[PDB]
Amino acid sequence: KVRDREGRINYYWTLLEPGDTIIFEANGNLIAPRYAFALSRGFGSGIINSNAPMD
C-alpha cells in the first residue's frame, strides 16, 4: 500500500509530430487523457534543484 492503494496506475507518454494521428483502442482499464500540451521548444532552459527564494 503506497498512499493507501494496493492497485496502481502506470503513466505513459508520447509526442505526436505535426501531421501524425493518435488512436486509442480499449475494452477496459484506460486512464484516458483530458488536456494535452502543444509545445514550441527552445534551449536556454533547464531543471534546477533549489531551496533559495525568488526575487
Binding site: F43, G44, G46, I48
Partner: protein, 61 residues
C-alpha cells in the same frame, strides 16, 4: 559559455549516472588545472616583464 548540467538517471541506470559523473568531474578537473597553471605561469611572466622594462630604461640613460 551557456550552462546546462542537471541530468537524472533511474535505479537500473547507475552505469550512465557514473559516466555523467566521470564527464562532469573530468571537465572541471582539466579547467581547474588549466586556469590555476596559466595564473601562476603568467604572473611569473608579468613580474619578469617589469624588471626587464625597468633595466631597459636604466640602459636608455
Amino acid at each position: 559559455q551557456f550552462t546546462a548540467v542537471g541530468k537524472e538517471f533511474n535505479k537500473l541506470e547507475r552505469r550512465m549516472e557514473n559516466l555523467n559523473k566521470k564527464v562532469d568531474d573530468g571537465f572541471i578537473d582539466i579547467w581547474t588545472y588549466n586556469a590555476e597553471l596559466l595564473v601562476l605561469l603568467e604572473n611569473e611572466r608579468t613580474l619578469d616583464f617589469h624588471d626587464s622594462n625597468v633595466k631597459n630604461l636604466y640602459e636608455k640613460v
